[PDB]
Amino acid sequence: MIVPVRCFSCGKVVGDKWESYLNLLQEDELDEGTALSRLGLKRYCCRRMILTHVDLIEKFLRYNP
């Protein structure tokens, strides 16, 4: 439900990364793992942040008013 700004654990701004992460997988047909490190996500605390997030915001937007 919308990408968290900053990783809970160490606080690296994971916020901007999302759109670019989705585009690495779709467009650059990269595997999730390589795509993650390409955005610069080195530690697994930051890595889970993106890798394990479920963007429910997109579902909620589907509701008209």
Partner: peptide, 18 residues
């Protein structure tokens, strides 16, 4: 606001519909 973003947007606050 800090923008380290390649595309020059940086941090998605939220999304809007109509």
């Amino acid at each position: 606001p800090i923008i380290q973003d390649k595309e020059g947007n940086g941090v998605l606050i939220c999304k809007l519909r109509k």
